[PDB]
Amino acid sequence: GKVQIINKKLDLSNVQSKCGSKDNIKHVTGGGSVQIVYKPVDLSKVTSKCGSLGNIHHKPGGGQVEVKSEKLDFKDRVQSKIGSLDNITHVPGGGNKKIETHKLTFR
Amino acid sequence: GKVQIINKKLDLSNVQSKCGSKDNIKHVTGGGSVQIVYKPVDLSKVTSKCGSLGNIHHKPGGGQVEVKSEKLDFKDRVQSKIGSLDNITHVPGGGNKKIETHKLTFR
Amino acid sequence: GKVQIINKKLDLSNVQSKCGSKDNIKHVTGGGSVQIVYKPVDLSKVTSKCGSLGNIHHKPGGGQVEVKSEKLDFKDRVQSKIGSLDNITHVPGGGNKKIETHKLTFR
Amino acid sequence: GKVQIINKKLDLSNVQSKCGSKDNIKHVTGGGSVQIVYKPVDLSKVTSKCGSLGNIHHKPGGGQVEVKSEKLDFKDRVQSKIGSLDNITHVPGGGNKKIETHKLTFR
């Protein structure tokens, strides 16, 4: 006779909580210019096979992102006023619980 | 006789909570110009096969993104006023729970 | 005799909650110009096969996105006023629960 | 005799909640000009096969998107007023639950 609980599990399991606030580029003040380039991706492919006495000129006018600001003139005040700023993050949650029970009762 | 609970699971399982606030480029103040380029993607392909005494000129006028601001003139005040700013994130939730029970009762 | 519970599962399972607020480019103030280019995608293909004494000029007038602002003149005030700003995120939910029971009762 | 519960499932299953607020380009104030280019896609194809002493000029007048603002003049005030702004997100829901039971009762 055999009365068994057998656990031969292969457990590559993931349990994850991400709770609260995640801010990128918050509260950026510029008197003249604010320039932001966020996560540009370039996956361009260029192939150039040149034969005998051949000529290839790969000369695009610019790259992926070009941002330009010029000739800004301010005569009077440039000002920012904030009376109060509160950045509150309260995380009572984000709890992980993993339970595994094996109970064998024999009579 | 055999009375068995057998667990031979292959557990590559994912449990995940993402709870609360995620802000990118929040509260950006510029007196003259705000320029934002967000996640441009370039997957362009160029192929240039040039034969004998051939000529290829690949010369596009610009790249993917060109942003330009010029000749801005302000005589009087340039101002921003905020009386109060509250950024509140409350996360009581986002809880993960994983339970696994094996119960064998024999008479 | 065999009385069995057998679990030979292949569990590549995904359980995920995404709860709350996600803001991109919120509250952007510009006195002169605001220029935003959001997620441009370029999947253009160019093929240029040039024969003997041939000539190819691939010269498009510009790339994908061109944004331009020029010659803006302000004599009097340029102003923004906000009395109060509240950004509140409350996430009591977003809970994940995964339960797996094996119960064998023998008489 | 065989009394069995057999679970040989191949579980590549997806359970996901996305609950709350998702804002892109919210609350953008520009004194002169606001220029927004949102998710332009270019899948253009150009093929140029040039023979002996041939000539190809691929010269389109511009690329996909061209946005231009020029010569704006403001004599008096340019102003924005908001008395109060509330951005409230409340997510009590967005809960995922996955239950799997195996019950074998033998007499």
Author numbering:
A (entry chain C), B (entry chain A), C (entry chain B), D (entry chain D): 273 to 379
Question: What are the paper's exact sentences on this?
Answer:
Two types of tau filaments, each made of a single protofilament, were present. In type I P301T filaments, the core spans residues G273-R379 of tau and adopts a new fold, in the shape of the letter V. It has a four-layered body and two-layered wings. The N-terminal half of the core sequence (residues 273–324) forms the inner side of the V-shaped fold with a sharp bend at the R2-R3 junction, whereas the C-terminal half (residues 325–379) curves around this bend on the outer side. The conformation of the R2-R3 junction in type I P301T filaments is different from that of type II P301T filaments, but it is almost identical to the conformations of the R2-R3 junction in filaments from mouse lines expressing human tau with mutations P301S or P301L. Missense mutations in P301 stabilise this conformation by creating an additional hydrogen bond to the main chain of an adjacent molecule. The side chain of T301 is on the outside surface of this common substructure and makes a solvent-mediated interaction with residue S352 of R4. The type I P301T fold also displays local similarities with the corticobasal degeneration (CBD) and AGD tau folds by sharing with them the substructures 312–333 in R3 and 337–357 in R4. In all three folds, residues 312–333 form a compact semi-detached unit, whereas residues 337–357 wrap around the R2-R3 junction. However, in the type I P301T filaments, the substructure from R4 makes interactions with the R2-R3 junction that have an inside-out conformation compared to the CBD and AGD folds.
Mutations in MAPT, the microtubule-associated protein tau gene, give rise to cases of frontotemporal dementia and parkinsonism linked to chromosome 17 (FTDP-17) with abundant filamentous tau inclusions in brain cells. Missense mutations of residue P301, which are the most common MAPT mutations associated with FTDP-17, give rise to the assembly of mutant four-repeat tau into filamentous inclusions, in the absence of extracellular deposits. The other three isoforms lack exon 10 expression and have three repeats (3R). These repeats and adjoining sequences constitute the microtubule-binding domains of tau. Part of this sequence also forms the core of assembled tau in neurodegenerative diseases, indicating that the physiological function of microtubule binding and the pathological assembly into amyloid filaments are mutually exclusive.
